[PDB]
Amino acid sequence: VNSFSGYLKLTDNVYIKNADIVEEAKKVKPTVVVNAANVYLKHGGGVAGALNKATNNAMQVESDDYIATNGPLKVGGSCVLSGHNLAKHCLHVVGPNVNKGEDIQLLKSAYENFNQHEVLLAPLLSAGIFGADPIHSLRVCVDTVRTNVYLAVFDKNLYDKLVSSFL
């Protein structure tokens, strides 16, 4: 039993809710919140911008030190950093950004990072300002992630479409 509330069950291990991931993280304080990161960990907008703002920019400060030491992430890759006031840990995962021309096949590699964590609160990777079809992202999630994932979808209209079209 865990503390996630109000989710619709899609599969054995994938759950979905219309929610603001920031507000959901603040209430649940999950072990892991996933950030929709880019390779530079520049958290300017979308989910990343929202999460970083909620940490009062502490996420960005930590991220800048990470990059200065380690260099950029790979598209499809990830790193574990602090969850600050939102979670124990933040798993920064880089899905391909279609608006930069990155290969959508890398979306499966991106979701594979979730399998290193037993339970996660997450957005749909490569959705929103990353330009991919969220219906496709949900399908890849369900077909790739085997650990327990709680998906937060900000947009109510999109949430309803994802549920109604789910096979």
Per CB under 6 A, residues contacting ligand S3R are: 19-22, 46-47, 50, 123-124, 127-129, 152-155, 158
- The SS3 of residue 79 is strand
**106 vs 152 by CB, closer to ligand S3R:** 152
Q: Given the complex with ligand S3R, which of 24 and 106 has the nearer CB atom?
A: 24
Report the residue number, 24 or 76, with the smaller CB distance to ligand S3R: 24
Please identify the residue of the shown chain whose CB is closest to the bound ligand S3R.
128
Comparing CB distances to ligand S3R, the nearer of 75 and 127 is: 127
42 CB contacts (<8 Å, ≥6 apart)?
Answer: 48, 60, 63
Closest approach, Cβ 58 to ligand S3R, in A, equals: 18
Give me the least distance between CB of 20 and ligand S3R, in Å please.
4
Q: How far is the CB of 6 from ligand S3R (least distance, A)?
A: 13
Residue 148: C-alpha distances to residues 34, 67, 75, 118 (Å): 13, 29, 23, 6
Query: Using CA atoms, how far apart are residues 35 and 83, in angstroms rounded to an integer?
Result: 10
Q: How far is the CB of 125 from ligand S3R (least distance, A)?
A: 9
Strand partners, 34: 91
Torsion angles phi and psi, residue 115, rounded to 5:
-70, -10
Token output for 19: 């929610």
